[PDB]
Amino acid sequence: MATFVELSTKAKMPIVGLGTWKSPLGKVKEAVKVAIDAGYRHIDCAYVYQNEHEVGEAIQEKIQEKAVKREDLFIVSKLWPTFFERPLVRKAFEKTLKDLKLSYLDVYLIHWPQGFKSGDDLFPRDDKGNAIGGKATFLDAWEAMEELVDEGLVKALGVSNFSHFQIEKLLNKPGLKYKPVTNQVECHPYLTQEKLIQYCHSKGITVTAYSPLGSPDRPWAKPEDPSLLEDPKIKEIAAKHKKTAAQVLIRFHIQRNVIVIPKSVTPARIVENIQVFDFKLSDEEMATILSFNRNWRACNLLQSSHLEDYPFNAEY
Ligand SMILES: NC(=O)c1ccc[n+]([C@@H]2O[C@H](COP(=O)([O-])OP(=O)(O)OC[C@H]3O[C@@H](n4cnc5c(N)ncnc54)[C@H](OP(=O)(O)O)[C@@H]3O)[C@@H](O)[C@H]2O)c1
Ligand SMILES: O=C(O)COc1cc(Cl)ccc1C(=O)NCc1c(Br)c(Br)c(Br)c(Br)c1Br
């Protein structure tokens, strides 16, 4: 189904993908199967979601049943920041690839720019809940990740939650073998990322929008927190096309040429979320939606600010 966004490597990244954060075991498998049936080809995964082994089962089921070919799939995973020391990059990725039951990843992302204490405690923190840093940096990680590409275990590298300063830091590293093909960040009408998107696009870096629906199931959600799916102005635009709010929030990205990865394990929503290629938001509707920016992050902590390379203090 989906149209694509051309990467700098000329690989074609499907513009709508399936999110898998918090997709439970015993539902993520069916989620993936339904999505591939509905025409999804891009699946967004991560080591830290601890459900890649169930994602792997589903992908293998559908390739073996002729529903899809491996080369038409676009599989993305992410390296967690406790594994930034070189030998741990390899062991984490190998766990990821084995779980996914694949011979290669299409894209491997640095999940978060700050290094955390190395090892298999994924969330090292002090008593007060603040992150514990490790000395390895995202540049150390990138180095070991470039080997995976040399060996063809990964077709391309990317970053996630990077501000333009840290991408500059990355692109200006003397000795860089490969460049990031995407920057995966939170993006939606409340956090429109105009400056970051402009920046990345000018450096030949695509943007992948995460939490496009305002991530309404996030466990740290307060009832006073803004809710994009219930936003009357968003709902007004959807009604105007006889579409759902989710469909408008997804199509918003497509029209900015931004890749977008709504998560669902509900078959109807998964199908709904990819029916976004039969309407168009007008120029005035795009303008209106863009105006909703209030720099609101659904995904934030301030529990790791004390570490170097915190991405959200910068303006973009
Ligand atoms: N790189 C990063 O740091 C990072 C951070 C956050 C997220 N992620 C990626 O981005 C993906 C998407 O973001 P997200 O999971 O935070 O939240 P999201 O996709 O904005 O929203 C997910 C929530 O919306 C519900 N939903 C999905 N479609 C719907 C629809 N059509 N109508 C009403 N509700 C709907 C889902 O419910 P059901 O599942 O019950 O259907 C789920 O509760 C993640 O799954 C993950 O792959 C990456
Ligand atoms: O990546 C996903 O799909 C799910 O993302 C999450 C899931 C949970 Cl339970 C809690 C927080 C997030 C999240 O904010 N991720 C982006 C993010 C990460 Br990563 C890290 Br590390 C830090 Br520090 C900060 Br701040 C932020 Br913002």
Boundaries of every domain in the chain:
1-316
Asked if residue 35 has its Cβ within 6 Å of ligand 1, the reply is no
Cα distances (Å, whole numbers) of residue 165 to 7, 141, 161: 21, 17, 11
266: annotated binding-site residue? yes
User: Could you write out the DSSP letters of every residue in 99-129?
Assistant: HHT-S-BSEEEES-SS-B-SSS-SS-B-TT-
Spatial separation of the C-alpha atoms in residues 222 and 225, rounded to whole Å: 5
Spatial separation of the C-alpha atoms in residues 209 and 183, rounded to whole Å: 9
Q: What are phi and psi of 11, to 5 degrees?
A: -55, 150
Token pair in block for residue 32: 């993936």
Neighbours of 263 (CB within 10 A): 24
Helix (H, G, I), strand (E, B) or coil at 246: helix
Amino acid at 36: I
Give the CA diameter of the chain. Answer: 54
Report the residue count for the chain. 316
- Rounded to 10°, the helix 245-254/283-291 angle is 100
If you measure from the C-alpha of residue 260 to the centroid of ligand 1, how many angstroms do you get, rounded to a whole number? 10
In the annotation, is 49 catalytic? yes
> Which region, left, alpha or beta, applies to residue 101 given φ > 0 means left and ψ of -120 to 50 means alpha?
left
User: Could you write out the DSSP letters of every residue in 207-237?
Assistant: EEEE-TT--TT-TT--TTS--GGG-HHHHHH
Amino acid at 57: E
Q: Which residue's structure tokens are 């089921």? A: 61
Cα distances (Å, whole numbers) of residue 75 to 52, 198, 226, 237, 291: 11, 25, 31, 32, 33
Q: Is 26 exposed, middle or buried (0-12, 13-18, 19+ CB in 10 A)?
A: exposed
Asked if residue 266 has its Cβ within 6 Å of ligand 1, the reply is yes
If you measure from the C-alpha of residue 239 to the centroid of ligand 2, how many angstroms do you get, rounded to a whole number? 32
Q: Which residue's structure tokens are 């894209």? A: 107
Give the containing element (helix H, strand E) for 42. strand 42-44
Q: Half-sphere exposure of residue 208, counting CA atoms within 13 Å on the CB side?
A: 32
If you measure from the C-alpha of residue 147 to the centroid of ligand 1, how many angstroms do you get, rounded to a whole number? 31
Q: Which residues pair with 131 in a beta bridge?
A: 125
If you measure from the C-alpha of residue 242 to the centroid of ligand 2, how many angstroms do you get, rounded to a whole number? 34
Q: Which residue's structure tokens are 């939490």? A: 211
Q: Are 27 and 197 contacting, i.e. CB atoms less than 8 angstroms apart?
A: no
Spatial separation of the C-alpha atoms in residues 110 and 260, rounded to whole Å: 18
Asked if residue 161 has its Cβ within 6 Å of ligand 1, the reply is yes
Q: Identify the experimental approach.
A: X-ray
Token pair in block for residue 165: 């300063």
Residue nearest to atom 15 of ligand 1 (CA): 263
With CA atoms as reference, report the closest residue to 273 among 223, 229, 207: 229
Spatial separation of the C-alpha atoms in residues 195 and 192, rounded to whole Å: 9
Q: Which residue's structure tokens are 């390379």? A: 309
> Among residues 49, 108, 199, 310, which one is catalytic?
49
Q: Are 116 and 81 contacting, i.e. CB atoms less than 8 angstroms apart?
A: yes
Q: What are phi and psi of 240, to 5 degrees?
A: -60, -25
Spatial separation of the C-alpha atoms in residues 45 and 23, rounded to whole Å: 10
Q: Is 299 exposed, middle or buried (0-12, 13-18, 19+ CB in 10 A)?
A: middle
> Which region, left, alpha or beta, applies to residue 241 given φ > 0 means left and ψ of -120 to 50 means alpha?
alpha
Spatial separation of the C-alpha atoms in residues 77 and 100, rounded to whole Å: 9
CA 169 centroid distance within chain: 21
Sign of the dihedral defined by the CA atoms of residues 259, 264, 267, 273, in that order: negative
Spatial separation of the C-alpha atoms in residues 173 and 171, rounded to whole Å: 6
Resolution for this experimental structure (Å) = 2.0
Amino acid at 180: P
Q: Are 217 and 22 contacting, i.e. CB atoms less than 8 angstroms apart?
A: yes
Token pair in block for residue 298: 């659904």
Spatial separation of the C-alpha atoms in residues 165 and 184, rounded to whole Å: 15
Residues contacting ligand 2 via CB (< 6 Å) = 21, 46, 111-112, 131, 161, 299-301, 304
| Residue among 299, 303, 313 to mutate when testing ligand 2 (max atoms within 8 A of CB) | 299
CATH 3.40.50.150 fits 1-316, yes or no: no
Q: Are 74 and 105 contacting, i.e. CB atoms less than 8 angstroms apart?
A: no
